[PDB]
Symmetry: C2
């Protein structure tokens, strides 16, 4: 007596998978009553997803409702989890199990399958250019010189822009093409390059300059941003 699972694999967000849970050594009862799916994200605990229950009432977790469907074909002695509109957070080992269905007081899950791994990913980053900003935050006083650095993981020529974002507001372009100031930007902002390091300098920090600053490369698509440097008051 066991449940054997198949169908897991690697998909991108928005994709679909169909997991199968084949029963061996016993017959699923009426309409697969009691068949249940549970998942376990890497390093995490168990999460109940769905159970075929009495009176044509399939039960689902809020985390999968409207995207996943549990069903069973007793003719084929197999149950299924149809998984539509997959998301990165659905990455997990997926288990099926048979919940006890002979007594109202015991629905515990037994005969758990070996699990099938589902990985939902848009990629590990691949060849995308990574922009590394340093420091990630700093506190300084009005009048201080502030220097923020941004390293490109590969050649980007001089195709680097700097933005400022204040809390609750949209980003504003400060400097483009490494060192050219956008109109209206105060002269205390300047940009430079030394090797693969790009620097935004504020020569004398003013009260209105507390903000988060971001670099951005446009040498290649995808356009990528540094993680940001928050400049705060001491």
């Amino acid at each position: 007596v066991q449940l054997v699972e198949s169908g897991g694999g690697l998909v991108q967000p928005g994709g679909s998978l169909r997991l199968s849970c084949a029963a061996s050594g016993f017959s699923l009862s009426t309409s697969g009553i009691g068949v249940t799916w549970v998942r376990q994200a890497p390093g995490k605990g168990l999460e109940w997803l769905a159970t075929i229950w009495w009176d044509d009432d399939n039960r689902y977790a809020d985390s999968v409702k409207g995207r996943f469907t549990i069903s069973a074909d007793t003719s084929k002695n197999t149950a299924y989890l149809q998984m539509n509109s997959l998301c990165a957070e659905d990455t997990a080992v997926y288990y099926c199990a048979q919940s006890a269905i002979t007594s109202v007081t015991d629905s515990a899950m037994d005969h758990w399958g070996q699990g099938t791994l589902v990985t939902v990913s848009s990629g590990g980053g691949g060849s995308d250019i990574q922009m590394t900003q340093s420091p990630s935050s700093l506190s300084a006083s009005v009048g201080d010189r502030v220097t923020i650095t941004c390293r490109a993981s590969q050649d980007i020529s001089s195709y680097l822009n700097w933005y400022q974002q204040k809390p609750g507001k949209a980003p504003k372009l400060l400097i483009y093409y490494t060192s050219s100031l956008h109109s209206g930007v105060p002269s205390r902002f300047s940009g430079s390059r030394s090797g693969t390091d790009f620097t935004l300098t504020i020569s004398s920090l003013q009260p209105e300059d507390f903000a988060t600053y971001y670099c951005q490369q446009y040498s290649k698509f995808p356009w990528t941003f540094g993680q940001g440097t928050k400049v705060e008051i001491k």
Copy 2:
């Protein structure tokens, strides 16, 4: 005159759902050589993520994180650009900005005149009523022969509708105890379960090396069925 971009269309949406955002442009024409519109998003508390740009060719440009789900387009008769967002995920929750951008590989390409943004919240809309199972300790280490106890607390009355499972490393969970205190077939009587109100206890007597595992409680008083966070037991 001043360029203005005004985003609209954000709101609440369920996972798997769709939304279309609009970016209405003033002060320039979307038809103009060199022009583009780009969408960038910012998840709560996080940085900026480029999503899509209108490009001179038939193929716009997209980030891998949204390709196949999102589509950027423009209706020049309304001087408005759009982001059609399909198959949404909780992780697409963010403020979505549009910005003015080039449509060819100019040496001064940047994003300017960013709009105020529109918030997209991807949410299931449920959970308030779910029974929470709180397990303690999260991990413990003991020696062969010892007796150890693992507790869980239900956030409301679940009568005796609680099970305990054992999961050895790399293996599927196995049932130990059902209905608070009944021993599953094949489980020896050095294991026991009890309860006092909403407080449940798994006791392992005469701890053995093979008991190295993570133990989970699970309630079935109500759907959704919910589990404790697990207790790792090491034997030393």
